[PDB]
Amino acid sequence: PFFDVQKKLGVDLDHWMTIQSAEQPHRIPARCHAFEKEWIECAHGIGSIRAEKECKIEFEDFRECLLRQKTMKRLNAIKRQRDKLIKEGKYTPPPHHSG
Amino acid sequence: NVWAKEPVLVASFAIAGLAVILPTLSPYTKYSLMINRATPYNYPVPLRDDGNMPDVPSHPQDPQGPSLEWLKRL
């Protein structure tokens, strides 16, 4: 079983190693701070089932902040398209440093 | 006594015990904590101006805010 002496004694000795956005020793954020704050406020007073079926949009926003999967997919598609059209030869590219 | 028996151990216990005790009788620990607190890492973030509060000074020259003066004077 899981017990709750952590809450019972009033010593929150283990809740600070836990998430981001708990106060760092110098007040700096992580890379996805605000996404976490809105996601935690979305799924706080929630029985973890309408958390699964209701906060899905902001959770996917947070996941794609954390890993940046499909944004890299879009950038990689741009890179492959740029490579094949410079292989073609149309507009010897002025996207680098000059016209 | 044991000063002839195992002397480096007794010296280690003595310097150990004074290292335990000596921060209790210390007129400099509050100085240490003020030095350690008064060094900022992040940006000192401003705030929305006033509810006409006699704090949070507008010019950084204004000494109404809490500053450091025991730094320059050792």
Partner: protein, 171 residues
Amino acid sequence: MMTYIVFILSIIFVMGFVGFSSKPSPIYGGLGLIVSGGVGCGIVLNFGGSFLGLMVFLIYLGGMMVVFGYTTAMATEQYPSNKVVLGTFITGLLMEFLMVYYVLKDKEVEIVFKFNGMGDWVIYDTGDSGFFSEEAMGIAALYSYGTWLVIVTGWSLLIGVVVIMEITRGN
């Protein structure tokens, strides 16, 4: 000498893991794990890596493989290569060659994932005001916030000491 140096050092890393997972004599195994630890240090220092990758180097390449080679020297003999060892090394090189060939000349290689295949200059910091090398102040916690963690870690090492002496004839 170019951009994908993290990827290339990762290639040498997985080659080193194959090079002692082929089961040689364990002093060759210690050599393979030392080479693998050095290039893993290279990878994490390429991510920077300012403290932790130089920190592992004293422990594994400073304190662990020493005792592994020590115990290789004092316990087992292995006094005289083989078909099975070098054959597994060949098949491991073949599997790495196949995976990296399909990373190179295609889009992505999927075990069950979508590994977006290009070298990682992404992602990285956009030149922030770090000023303290965030690893450094992070590990410069554990003594203000770290009440429980270092206590149970040191307690586990103390119990490790009494365990080792008991099994090696306590008291």
